Every structure is written in structure tokens, then in C-alpha cells.
Write an enzyme that holds these catalytic residues in place. Structure first.
Site, PDB file in Angstrom:
ATOM      1  N   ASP A  35     -10.156  -7.255 -14.875  1.00 17.54           N
ATOM      2  CA  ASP A  35      -9.054  -8.090 -14.357  1.00 17.54           C
ATOM      3  C   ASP A  35      -9.046  -9.412 -15.105  1.00 17.54           C
ATOM      4  OD1 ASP A  35      -7.173  -9.376 -12.744  1.00 17.54           O
ATOM      5  OD2 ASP A  35      -8.370  -9.307 -10.951  1.00 17.54           O
ATOM      6  N   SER A 199       6.578 -16.943 -22.376  1.00 16.68           N
ATOM      7  CA  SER A 199       7.382 -16.053 -23.195  1.00 16.68           C
ATOM      8  C   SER A 199       8.677 -16.755 -23.583  1.00 16.68           C
ATOM      9  CB  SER A 199       7.678 -14.775 -22.406  1.00 16.68           C
ATOM     10  OG  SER A 199       8.584 -13.932 -23.090  1.00 16.68           O
TER      11      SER A 199
HETATM   12  C1  RD4 Z   1      -4.249 -13.760  -3.982  1.00 11.46           C
HETATM   13  C2  RD4 Z   1      -4.430 -13.059  -5.276  1.00 11.46           C
HETATM   14  O1  RD4 Z   1      -3.435 -13.547  -6.166  1.00 11.46           O
HETATM   15  C3  RD4 Z   1      -3.412 -13.054  -7.437  1.00 11.46           C
HETATM   16  C4  RD4 Z   1      -2.417 -13.602  -8.222  1.00 11.46           C
HETATM   17  C5  RD4 Z   1      -2.375 -13.294  -9.568  1.00 11.46           C
HETATM   18  C6  RD4 Z   1      -3.312 -12.438 -10.116  1.00 11.46           C
HETATM   19  C7  RD4 Z   1      -4.291 -11.869  -9.320  1.00 11.46           C
HETATM   20  C8  RD4 Z   1      -5.273 -10.941  -9.903  1.00 11.46           C
HETATM   21  N1  RD4 Z   1      -6.431 -10.745  -9.328  1.00 11.46           N
HETATM   22  N2  RD4 Z   1      -4.960 -10.272 -10.979  1.00 11.46           N
HETATM   23  C9  RD4 Z   1      -4.338 -12.174  -7.966  1.00 11.46           C
HETATM   24  C1  RD4 Z   2      -5.400  -7.791  -9.137  1.00  5.15           C
HETATM   25  C2  RD4 Z   2      -6.078  -6.491  -8.968  1.00  5.15           C
HETATM   26  O1  RD4 Z   2      -5.894  -6.035  -7.620  1.00  5.15           O
HETATM   27  C3  RD4 Z   2      -6.470  -4.842  -7.286  1.00  5.15           C
HETATM   28  C4  RD4 Z   2      -7.176  -4.189  -8.284  1.00  5.15           C
HETATM   29  C5  RD4 Z   2      -7.773  -2.975  -8.006  1.00  5.15           C
HETATM   30  C6  RD4 Z   2      -7.651  -2.409  -6.751  1.00  5.15           C
HETATM   31  C7  RD4 Z   2      -6.937  -3.056  -5.760  1.00  5.15           C
HETATM   32  C8  RD4 Z   2      -6.786  -2.447  -4.426  1.00  5.15           C
HETATM   33  N1  RD4 Z   2      -5.844  -2.866  -3.620  1.00  5.15           N
HETATM   34  N2  RD4 Z   2      -7.601  -1.496  -4.051  1.00  5.15           N
HETATM   35  C9  RD4 Z   2      -6.356  -4.290  -6.026  1.00  5.15           C
END
Ligand code: RD4
Ligand code: RD4
Length: 330
Positions: A35, A199
Site C-alpha cells: 500500500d 496530473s
Molecule cells: C481512512 C483511510 O483513508 C485512506 C485514504 C487514502 C488512502 C488510503 C490507503 N490506505 N491507501 C486510506
Molecule cells: C487501502 C487498502 O485498503 C484495503 C486493502 C486491503 C484489504 C482491505 C479490506 N477491506 N479487507 C482494505
């Protein structure tokens, strides 16, 4: 040093990508979701509430001779889709694709939310955003990349995600055979802890390019491409029968449609997302309504260049003193 690891879609839709990671001594290999939008390395573990584990591979720190409890440290994270996890922290040796970091904070889950439990293919997350977002308390911890950076041949990592196919994460070098043409670099703001960039505009299909600044984040951990409502409406207007569905939660389109491409600007360069990359398949099994891969960001607060966009490019995350992003076609 360098590392190179293959990343593999978890399913036939590319909903996420998993990369094998070696943790501990002897190694325990877990498949993690790299991530670039978060900064915690967390894993399902022997400490995870048993009813919340359903098929994942777990990290057992007591079986690792190099694991050490990071005394007093806890962590807790949300993903914005309603999921979350939390727990305590060990330090241990972590290797990715032959690149080894000693003393990496490995955040052991005591609790995970249901959508985690329900996905047996994801054993945890490896965050690659800036360490200022790391949630460990009371002492914030560094990401794997931050810990490795000084040892790398060059302070970079690259994401080369496949469309319905495996791809590659490289650390410490830029594989000049992995892309076509040149890499266009663009400025990054780290003020929100993300790989945030602007962008230069977009085009829909064979249409004219609209020059307009779109601030957003390069996020391997997000599946879809989330853009301003104006842009998204312009895209789906070119798909007969497409509409935004409040009940489904976004734009849907007839599965019989052929989708147009979507181009985004990186400086004067252009990355073309083929239409097929924007098809996320039936909303439910057997449905003829399909879920779109370009969705409005209006309810999030930042534009996100997720996997739909990134998989159309070779992407350089340049972690030099002033970070930048690079994009090439491939
Ligand atoms: C509250 C979580 O908010 C975000 C916002 C943007 C990116 C991600 C992320 N983990 N890729 C998570
Ligand atoms: C920003 C990445 O958010 C994720 C990534 C991988 C899994 C999950 C989930 N909801 N189980 C969420």
C-alpha cells in the site's frame, strides 16, 4: 542493495495484489498487500482473535528467534472502506525479494474487521507511504522502504502492476527493460503523508485532451481510480446505459458495453488506461450490470490514482531528499 518481488492479483478482477514477504528467523512467508497510501506493516498473527482468522497465513513471533516485543507499542488503522485493524508490535527481520531489513516494526494484529477476515488471500499490509502516517504509539515507526533506503543502490522503488497478470515491485533500481519510451517525473507533496502529485489533465477515448490540474495520490493500495465528479461524468457519458447507482454505490454500466480508454496527463506525457482495465465485472453473480473502475472522489476528499491507473504505467516512487514520482508507458 536491491530487491525484486513478483506481485500477483488476488482474483480475476485485480481487486488487490499480494507480494510474498519473509518475516522472522526462520522465515515465515506471508502474502502482503503493498500500500503506497499507508505506512504500517501489519500482519495476521498468532495474537489475532481466533474467530477473526479464516484461512490467512499468520506470523507467530514466538517461533522467530529474531523477534522482539516493542514494549508498550500499539497500533490502530482504518482503510476508509469501513475496515480496520489494531494490535501490538514486534521488531523482526523482514525481507522482500532478496532485500533484508533488520529491526523492522511488524505490527501484529490482535483485531481485524470483518472484510479482512473474509478475504483469505491477504495476510496483512505493507505500507509504502511516508512514515509520518505510521500509526504506532507512543513511538512512531518507519516503513520498510524508509528503513531500507540508505542501503539501496538508489533511494527508489517501482511499481509495475499487471492487468489480469502478475507484475513486479523493485527496490533500489529502475529496470530500464520494463517500460517503453521515457519516464516523466513530476513533483510530490508529502504534506499529507502521501505520494501526492498533480496530473495535468485527461481525455476520454479518442477525445481531445482537457488541460486541468488534478491533485491526487498514487495509491497501490486503492483498487479503483477516483477522480472529480465532473471528470467521471464525462467518462461515463461515453458509455451507453451507464449511470451512477446510489444503491450499488457508484457508476455501473451494461456488461455488453465496450468501454473507452481514459488518458491522464503526467506533465506533457500521457498515460492511456485501456477500456478493459475499467471493467470490474458484474455487480453480483449473474448480473448484466457491471461495476465501473472510474468512480467519483466527491465523498473521499482527495483524488486517488489507484490500481486502475497505476497498472497502465511503470511507476517510480523516488524517495530522494525531495521525493518525486515518475510514470512511463509500458
Ligand atoms: C481512512 C483511510 O483513508 C485512506 C485514504 C487514502 C488512502 C488510503 C490507503 N490506505 N491507501 C486510506
Ligand atoms: C487501502 C487498502 O485498503 C484495503 C486493502 C486491503 C484489504 C482491505 C479490506 N477491506 N479487507 C482494505
Amino acid at each position: 542493495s536491491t530487491g525484486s518481488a513478483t506481485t500477483t492479483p488476488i482474483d480475476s478482477l485485480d481487486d488487490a495484489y499480494i507480494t510474498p514477504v519473509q518475516i522472522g528467523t526462520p522465515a515465515q512467508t506471508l502474502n502482503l498487500d503493498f500500500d503506497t497510501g499507508s505506512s504500517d506493516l501489519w500482519v495476521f498473527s498468532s495474537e489475532t482473535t481466533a474467530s477473526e482468522v479464516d484461512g490467512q497465513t499468520i506470523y507467530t513471533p514466538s517461533k522467530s528467534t529474531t523477534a522482539k516485543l516493542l514494549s508498550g507499542a500499539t497500533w490502530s488503522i482504518s482503510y476508509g472502506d469501513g475496515s480496520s485493524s489494531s494490535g501490538d508490535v514486534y521488531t523482526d527481520t523482514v525481507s522482500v525479494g532478496g532485500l533484508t531489513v533488520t529491526g523492522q516494526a511488524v505490527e501484529s494484529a490482535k483485531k481485524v474487521s470483518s472484510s479482512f477476515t473474509e478475504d483469505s488471500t491477504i495476510d496483512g499490509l505493507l505500507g509504502l507511504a511516508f512514515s509520518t502516517l505510521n500509526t504506532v504509539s507512543p513511538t512512531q515507526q518507519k516503513t520498510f522502504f524508509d528503513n531500507a533506503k540508505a542501503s539501496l543502490d538508489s533511494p527508489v522503488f517501482t511499481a509495475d502492476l499487471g492487468y489480469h497478470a502478475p507484475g513486479t515491485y523493485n527496490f533500489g533500481f529502475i529496470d530500464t527493460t520494463a517500460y517503453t519510451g521515457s519516464i516523466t517525473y513530476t513533483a510530490v507533496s508529502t504534506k499529507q503523508g502521501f505520494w501526492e502529485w498533480t496530473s495535468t489533465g485527461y481525455a476520454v477515448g479518442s477525445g481531445t485532451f482537457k488541460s486541468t490540474s488534478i491533485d491526487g495520490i498514487a495509491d497501490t493500495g486503492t483498487t479503483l481510480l477516483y477522480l472529480p465528479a465532473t471528470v467521471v461524468s464525462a467518462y461515463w457519458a461515453q458509455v451507453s446505459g451507464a449511470k451512477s447507482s446510489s444503491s450499488v454505490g457508484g457508476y455501473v454500466f451494461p456488461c455488453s458495453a465496450t468501454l473507452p480508454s481514459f488518458t491522464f496527463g503526467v506533465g506533457s506525457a500521457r498515460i492511456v488506461i485501456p477500456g478493459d482495465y475499467i471493467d470490474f465485472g458484474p455487480i453480483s453473480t449473474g448480473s448484466s450490470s457491471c461495476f465501473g473502475g472510474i468512480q467519483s472522489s466527491a465523498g473521499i476528499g482527495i483524488n486517488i490514482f489507484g490500481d486502475v491507473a497505476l497498472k497502465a504505467a511503470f511507476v517510480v516512487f523516488n524517495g530522494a531528499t525531495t521525493p518525486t514520482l515518475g510514470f512511463a508507458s509500458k
